Design a protein around this ligand. Structure first.
Ligand SMILES: CCCCCCCC/C=C\CCCCCCCC(=O)O[C@H](COC(=O)CCCCCCCCCCCCCCC)COP(=O)(O)OCCN
Ligand SMILES: [K+]
Length: 214
């Protein structure tokens, strides 16, 4: 309906939004069991990209009850193709040739995150909630089996459980500092982390959950 410009420079520099996503991510990390090849997983940096998402404002409403004018809630399409990153640190546990033969601290960066999602942004009491709804190309939308009008008789019904991936692409890069095999275990950790991050966004940033920022 209507495109919205966005001051990425202002957003990219707000120290409270950056800490805030780090707070969200680390707090949600503590619910994830870590397998034998990793210890002490934490998000240590977060960098918004150079580029904003394209944003199309579809609708405006009073925020839904469950988030509890001048309170407001936007229904938006985010088309994000930028270069945002998340840095994680961890201890890589090598279990070859013996169990815990060696432990190496490593740094990983999740980046190249591609999404094209319907999303809610609820502003109330100086707070912003961000709740990803579903990919814009989810078949449930074309088939009219999922309703995404928050005002809104059948908003996000039982069929939302069959939602497709919210994340269209994602890369993880491990930085070296590990001349010391190691790469087999890094590969297991890369795979583990992509899956973890997918699951954390799905379960904690997507309706009926959301990211709560100040
Ligand atoms: C693991 C996931 C990591 C990334 C998770 C999301 C982190 C996104 C980072 C920050 C959220 C965006 C900050 C939005 C700034 C708040 C809105 C704003 O200033 O622009 C407001 C108008 O502009 C808008 O509508 C903002 C729309 C931008 C939404 C951006 C959403 C971020 C999307 C990131 C791409 C998705 C990648 C997610 C990766 C999993 C003006 O506000 P106001 O009513 O004049 O005053 C209210 C004062 N609070
Ligand atoms: K472990």
């Amino acid at each position: 309906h209507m495109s919205v410009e966005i001051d990425w420079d202002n957003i990219r520099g707000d120290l409270s939004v950056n800490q805030g996503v780090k707070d969200f991510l680390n707090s949600r990390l503590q619910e994830f069991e870590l397998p034998s090849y990793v210890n002490n997983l934490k998000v240590t940096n977060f960098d918004l990209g150079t580029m904003p998402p394209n944003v199309i404002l579809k609708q405006m409403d009073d925020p839904l009850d469950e988030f509890y004018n001048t309170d407001v809630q936007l229904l938006v399409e985010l088309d994000y193709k930028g270069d945002m990153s998340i840095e994680l640190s961890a201890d890589l546990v090598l279990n070859y040739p013996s169990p815990q033969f060696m432990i190496l601290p490593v740094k990983l960066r999740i980046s190249d995150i591609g999404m094209h999602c319907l999303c809610l942004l609820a502003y109330l009491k100086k707070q912003l909630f961000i709740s990803f709804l579903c990919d814009v190309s989810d078949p449930l939308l074309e088939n009219d089996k999922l309703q995404v009008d928050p005002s809104g008789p059948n908003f996000m019904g039982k069929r939302a459980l069959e939602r497709i991936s919210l994340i269209r692409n994602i890369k993880i890069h491990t930085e070296l500092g590990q001349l010391d095999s190691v790469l087999r275990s890094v590969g297991k950790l890369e795979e583990f982390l992509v899956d973890l991050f997918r699951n954390l966004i799905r379960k904690e940033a997507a309706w009926p959950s959301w990211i709560d920022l100040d």
